[PDB]
Amino acid sequence: GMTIKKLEHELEKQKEEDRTFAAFLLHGIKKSADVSFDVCNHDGECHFAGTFAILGGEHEMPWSFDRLFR
């Protein structure tokens, strides 16, 4: 629903709190794939960390991100 002005305010609020991120370095993995990863404590207890997807296929041009995906 947010207006541009409103959205900016909303975003800043997020900034206020500390956050922890996982970073991924992605390169062409010759195909489309879905990745799921979980965070696990030493106990071995785990929770679903998150998901991201890679769109690709054969004859794709090669590519690698300059930076990490957060």
Binding residues vs other proteins (CB under 8 A)? 3-6, 8-10, 26-28, 55-57, 59-61, 63-65
Compare residues 23 and 61 and give the one whose CB is closer to other proteins: 61
Rounded to a whole number of angstroms, the minimum distance from the CB of residue 43 to other proteins is 37
What is the rounded end-to-end Cα distance, in angstroms, of the chain? Answer: 26
Compare residues 2 and 39 and give the one whose CB is closer to other proteins: 2
What whole-number distance in Å separates Cα of residue 35 and Cα of residue 26? 11
Tokens of 41: 């404590």
What whole-number distance in Å separates Cα of residue 60 and Cα of residue 32? 10
Compare residues 27 and 38 and give the one whose CB is closer to other proteins: 27
